[PDB]
Protein backbone atom coordinates (compact mmCIF):
# COMPACT_ATOMS: atom_id res chain seq x y z
CA UNK A 1 0.00 0.00 0.00
CA UNK A 2 1.18 3.49 -0.99
CA UNK A 3 0.79 6.71 1.03
CA UNK A 4 1.25 10.10 -0.72
CA UNK A 5 0.88 13.88 -0.09
CA UNK A 6 -1.85 15.98 -1.77
CA UNK A 7 -5.43 22.90 -8.97
CA UNK A 8 -6.66 25.53 -11.49
CA UNK A 9 -4.30 28.53 -11.23
CA UNK A 10 -5.54 31.45 -13.40
CA UNK A 11 -4.27 34.32 -11.17
CA UNK A 12 -0.83 35.77 -11.76
CA UNK A 13 1.55 37.39 -9.24
CA UNK A 14 5.00 39.17 -9.29
CA UNK A 15 8.01 37.85 -7.24
CA UNK A 16 11.58 39.03 -7.15
CA UNK A 17 13.25 35.58 -7.11
CA UNK A 18 10.79 33.41 -9.21
CA UNK A 19 9.63 35.96 -11.75
CA UNK A 20 5.95 36.10 -12.69
CA UNK A 21 4.07 33.01 -11.45
CA UNK A 22 0.58 31.46 -11.76
CA UNK A 23 -1.13 30.90 -8.38
CA UNK A 24 -5.46 32.45 -6.23
CA UNK A 25 -4.31 35.96 -5.21
CA UNK A 26 -4.94 38.58 -2.54
CA UNK A 27 -5.01 41.99 -4.20
CA UNK A 28 -3.21 44.79 -2.30
CA UNK A 29 -4.36 47.51 -4.67
CA UNK A 30 -7.35 49.73 -5.51
CA UNK A 31 -8.01 52.55 -7.97
CA UNK A 32 -10.06 54.96 -5.85
CA UNK A 33 -12.83 57.15 -7.27
CA UNK A 34 -13.10 60.97 -7.34
CA UNK A 35 -15.41 62.19 -4.65
CA UNK A 36 -16.23 65.45 -2.89
CA UNK A 37 -14.14 66.70 0.00
CA UNK A 38 -14.82 65.91 3.63
CA UNK A 39 -13.84 66.28 7.22
CA UNK A 40 -10.60 64.56 8.16
CA UNK A 41 -11.28 61.96 10.85
CA UNK A 42 -9.17 62.63 13.83
CA UNK A 43 -8.70 66.32 13.23
CA UNK A 44 -9.93 69.90 12.91
CA UNK A 45 -10.42 70.82 9.26
CA UNK A 46 -10.43 74.51 8.29
Amino acid at each position, epitope marked *: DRICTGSNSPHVVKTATQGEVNVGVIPLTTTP*T*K*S*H*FANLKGTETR
Partner: antibody
Amino acid sequence: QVQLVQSGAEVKKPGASVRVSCRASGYIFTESGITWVRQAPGQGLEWMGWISGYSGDTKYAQKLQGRVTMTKDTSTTTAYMELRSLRYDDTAVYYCARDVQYSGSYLGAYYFDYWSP
Amino acid sequence: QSVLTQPPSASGTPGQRVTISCSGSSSNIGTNYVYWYQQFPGTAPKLLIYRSYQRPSGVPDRFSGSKSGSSASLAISGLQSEDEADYYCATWDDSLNGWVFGGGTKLTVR
Protein backbone atom coordinates in the same frame (compact mmCIF):
# COMPACT_ATOMS: atom_id res chain seq x y z
CA GLN B 1 -37.81 75.56 1.34
CA VAL B 2 -35.13 75.63 -1.36
CA GLN B 3 -36.41 77.94 -4.14
CA LEU B 4 -35.13 79.17 -7.49
CA VAL B 5 -37.10 81.82 -9.39
CA GLN B 6 -36.16 82.95 -12.91
CA SER B 7 -36.95 85.96 -15.11
CA GLY B 8 -39.82 85.88 -17.61
CA ALA B 9 -39.88 84.28 -21.05
CA GLU B 10 -37.80 86.13 -23.66
CA VAL B 11 -37.94 86.58 -27.45
CA LYS B 12 -35.00 87.96 -29.44
CA LYS B 13 -33.78 88.58 -33.00
CA PRO B 14 -30.71 86.60 -34.05
CA GLY B 15 -27.52 88.45 -33.08
CA ALA B 16 -28.82 90.15 -29.94
CA SER B 17 -28.21 88.87 -26.39
CA VAL B 18 -30.27 87.67 -23.39
CA ARG B 19 -29.74 88.07 -19.68
CA VAL B 20 -31.63 85.47 -17.65
CA SER B 21 -32.08 85.97 -13.92
CA CYS B 22 -32.09 83.38 -11.14
CA ARG B 23 -33.08 84.45 -7.59
CA ALA B 24 -32.27 82.10 -4.72
CA SER B 25 -34.19 81.25 -1.50
CA GLY B 26 -34.15 78.94 1.50
CA TYR B 27 -30.47 78.11 1.76
CA ILE B 28 -27.17 79.88 2.36
CA PHE B 29 -26.49 81.25 -1.12
CA THR B 30 -22.89 82.17 -0.26
CA GLU B 31 -22.10 78.52 0.39
CA SER B 32 -23.37 77.02 -2.87
CA GLY B 33 -23.19 77.68 -6.57
CA ILE B 34 -25.36 77.87 -9.65
CA THR B 35 -25.13 75.79 -12.79
CA TRP B 36 -27.11 76.49 -15.93
CA VAL B 37 -28.42 73.81 -18.26
CA ARG B 38 -30.42 74.35 -21.42
CA GLN B 39 -32.80 72.19 -23.43
CA ALA B 40 -33.55 72.69 -27.11
CA PRO B 41 -37.24 71.97 -27.80
CA GLY B 42 -37.83 68.20 -27.82
CA GLN B 43 -34.14 67.45 -27.21
CA GLY B 44 -31.61 66.59 -24.50
CA LEU B 45 -29.85 68.54 -21.75
CA GLU B 46 -26.76 70.68 -22.39
CA TRP B 47 -24.62 71.84 -19.49
CA MET B 48 -23.62 75.52 -19.89
CA GLY B 49 -21.52 76.41 -16.85
CA TRP B 50 -21.25 77.13 -13.15
CA ILE B 51 -20.58 80.10 -10.87
CA SER B 52 -19.69 80.23 -7.17
CA GLY B 53 -22.01 82.09 -4.80
CA TYR B 54 -18.98 82.46 -2.56
CA SER B 55 -16.37 83.93 -4.94
CA GLY B 56 -17.94 84.57 -8.34
CA ASP B 57 -15.56 82.04 -9.84
CA THR B 58 -16.93 80.58 -13.08
CA LYS B 59 -16.42 77.62 -15.41
CA TYR B 60 -18.22 77.45 -18.74
CA ALA B 61 -18.76 74.66 -21.25
CA GLN B 62 -16.08 74.65 -23.93
CA LYS B 63 -18.61 75.25 -26.71
CA LEU B 64 -19.90 78.40 -24.99
CA GLN B 65 -16.68 80.12 -23.86
CA GLY B 66 -16.64 83.52 -25.49
CA ARG B 67 -20.42 83.78 -25.88
CA VAL B 68 -21.57 83.23 -22.29
CA THR B 69 -21.02 85.19 -19.06
CA MET B 70 -22.20 84.37 -15.58
CA THR B 71 -22.33 86.83 -12.70
CA LYS B 72 -24.00 86.80 -9.29
CA ASP B 73 -25.11 89.25 -6.62
CA THR B 74 -24.80 88.26 -2.94
CA SER B 75 -27.10 91.13 -1.84
CA THR B 76 -30.05 89.93 -3.83
CA THR B 77 -28.85 86.31 -3.77
CA THR B 78 -29.39 86.24 -7.51
CA ALA B 79 -27.38 84.77 -10.37
CA TYR B 80 -27.39 85.90 -14.01
CA MET B 81 -26.53 84.18 -17.26
CA GLU B 82 -25.78 86.27 -20.34
CA LEU B 83 -25.73 84.68 -23.78
CA ARG B 84 -24.42 86.86 -26.66
CA SER B 85 -24.75 86.55 -30.46
CA LEU B 86 -27.97 84.49 -30.44
CA ARG B 87 -28.55 82.09 -33.30
CA TYR B 88 -31.56 79.80 -33.86
CA ASP B 89 -29.75 77.00 -32.00
CA ASP B 90 -30.01 79.05 -28.82
CA THR B 91 -33.80 78.55 -28.70
CA ALA B 92 -34.21 76.46 -25.56
CA VAL B 93 -35.46 76.33 -22.03
CA TYR B 94 -32.86 77.68 -19.61
CA TYR B 95 -32.73 76.05 -16.22
CA CYS B 96 -30.67 77.15 -13.29
CA ALA B 97 -29.86 74.61 -10.62
CA ARG B 98 -28.40 74.73 -7.11
CA ASP B 99 -24.88 73.32 -7.28
CA VAL B 100 -23.34 72.04 -4.03
CA GLN B 101 -19.76 73.16 -4.87
CA TYR B 102 -18.64 76.74 -4.03
CA SER B 103 -14.82 76.85 -3.99
CA GLY B 104 -11.82 74.93 -5.27
CA SER B 105 -11.43 73.99 -8.94
CA TYR B 106 -14.76 73.02 -10.46
CA LEU B 107 -14.19 69.43 -11.51
CA GLY B 108 -17.52 67.62 -11.10
CA ALA B 109 -16.64 66.04 -7.73
CA TYR B 110 -19.89 67.60 -6.45
CA TYR B 111 -23.30 67.75 -8.17
CA PHE B 112 -26.30 70.01 -8.74
CA ASP B 113 -29.55 69.47 -6.84
CA TYR B 114 -32.77 71.38 -7.36
CA TRP B 115 -33.75 72.79 -10.74
CA SER B 116 -35.71 76.00 -11.31
CA PRO B 117 -39.01 75.86 -13.28
CA GLN C 1 -23.92 62.17 -31.12
CA SER C 2 -24.36 62.42 -27.34
CA VAL C 3 -21.22 61.57 -25.38
CA LEU C 4 -23.14 59.15 -23.20
CA THR C 5 -25.18 56.60 -25.11
CA GLN C 6 -28.73 55.90 -23.91
CA PRO C 7 -31.24 53.78 -25.76
CA PRO C 8 -34.09 56.03 -26.94
CA SER C 9 -36.71 53.59 -25.65
CA ALA C 10 -37.20 51.24 -22.71
CA SER C 11 -40.41 49.44 -21.77
CA GLY C 12 -42.09 46.84 -19.59
CA THR C 13 -45.53 45.69 -18.49
CA PRO C 14 -46.59 47.04 -15.08
CA GLY C 15 -44.92 45.21 -12.21
CA GLN C 16 -41.90 44.15 -14.27
CA ARG C 17 -38.30 45.27 -13.81
CA VAL C 18 -36.83 47.28 -16.64
CA THR C 19 -33.30 48.56 -17.02
CA ILE C 20 -31.89 51.56 -18.80
CA SER C 21 -28.26 51.46 -19.87
CA CYS C 22 -25.85 54.33 -20.30
CA SER C 23 -22.65 53.86 -22.19
CA GLY C 24 -19.60 56.10 -21.92
CA SER C 25 -15.82 56.03 -21.76
CA SER C 26 -12.79 56.30 -19.50
CA SER C 27 -12.86 60.13 -19.28
CA ASN C 28 -16.49 60.22 -18.07
CA ILE C 29 -18.34 57.22 -16.57
CA GLY C 30 -15.04 55.36 -16.09
CA THR C 31 -13.55 57.86 -13.66
CA ASN C 32 -16.55 59.82 -12.45
CA TYR C 33 -19.79 59.57 -10.51
CA VAL C 34 -23.00 58.97 -12.40
CA TYR C 35 -26.22 60.88 -11.81
CA TRP C 36 -29.75 60.15 -12.98
CA TYR C 37 -32.57 62.63 -13.65
CA GLN C 38 -36.23 62.00 -14.35
CA GLN C 39 -38.34 64.39 -16.38
CA PHE C 40 -42.08 64.46 -16.95
CA PRO C 41 -43.20 66.51 -20.00
CA GLY C 42 -43.01 70.28 -19.48
CA THR C 43 -41.36 70.05 -16.06
CA ALA C 44 -37.90 70.47 -14.56
CA PRO C 45 -35.79 67.36 -14.41
CA LYS C 46 -35.55 65.90 -10.89
CA LEU C 47 -32.56 64.19 -9.25
CA LEU C 48 -33.33 60.51 -8.98
CA ILE C 49 -29.98 58.84 -8.29
CA TYR C 50 -26.78 60.49 -7.14
CA ARG C 51 -23.14 59.39 -6.90
CA SER C 52 -23.97 56.29 -8.97
CA TYR C 53 -25.85 54.42 -6.19
CA GLN C 54 -27.62 56.86 -3.83
CA ARG C 55 -31.27 57.79 -3.51
CA PRO C 56 -32.45 61.32 -2.65
CA SER C 57 -35.25 61.45 -0.09
CA GLY C 58 -38.58 60.77 -1.77
CA VAL C 59 -37.13 58.37 -4.32
CA PRO C 60 -38.46 54.84 -3.63
CA ASP C 61 -36.11 51.82 -3.41
CA ARG C 62 -37.83 50.71 -6.65
CA PHE C 63 -35.19 52.81 -8.43
CA SER C 64 -31.66 51.40 -8.39
CA GLY C 65 -28.32 52.58 -9.70
CA SER C 66 -25.52 50.39 -11.01
CA LYS C 67 -22.01 51.05 -12.47
CA SER C 68 -19.35 48.89 -14.12
CA GLY C 69 -16.31 50.28 -15.92
CA SER C 70 -17.40 52.92 -18.44
CA SER C 71 -21.07 52.00 -18.30
CA ALA C 72 -23.82 52.72 -15.80
CA SER C 73 -27.39 51.49 -15.59
CA LEU C 74 -30.71 52.50 -14.05
CA ALA C 75 -33.03 49.71 -12.85
CA ILE C 76 -36.74 50.39 -12.27
CA SER C 77 -38.47 47.49 -10.50
CA GLY C 78 -42.16 47.01 -9.73
CA LEU C 79 -42.88 49.23 -12.74
CA GLN C 80 -45.80 51.62 -12.33
CA SER C 81 -47.77 53.99 -14.53
CA GLU C 82 -46.34 57.09 -12.85
CA ASP C 83 -42.82 56.05 -13.90
CA GLU C 84 -43.64 56.99 -17.48
CA ALA C 85 -41.03 59.71 -18.13
CA ASP C 86 -37.64 60.46 -19.66
CA TYR C 87 -34.50 59.34 -17.88
CA TYR C 88 -31.15 61.09 -18.29
CA CYS C 89 -27.72 60.00 -17.11
CA ALA C 90 -25.02 62.61 -16.42
CA THR C 91 -21.33 62.49 -15.38
CA TRP C 92 -18.42 64.88 -15.56
CA ASP C 93 -16.09 64.43 -18.51
CA ASP C 94 -12.44 65.21 -17.86
CA SER C 95 -11.68 65.27 -21.57
CA LEU C 96 -14.26 67.95 -22.48
CA ASN C 97 -13.83 69.88 -19.12
CA GLY C 98 -17.64 69.89 -18.46
CA TRP C 99 -20.76 67.89 -17.53
CA VAL C 100 -22.22 65.50 -20.14
CA PHE C 101 -25.73 64.15 -20.66
CA GLY C 102 -27.04 60.98 -22.23
CA GLY C 103 -29.60 61.40 -24.99
CA GLY C 104 -32.38 60.39 -22.63
CA THR C 105 -34.43 57.20 -22.66
CA LYS C 106 -38.22 57.32 -22.79
CA LEU C 107 -39.77 54.77 -20.40
CA THR C 108 -43.09 53.37 -21.55
CA VAL C 109 -45.01 51.00 -19.33
CA ARG C 110 -51.16 49.70 -21.61
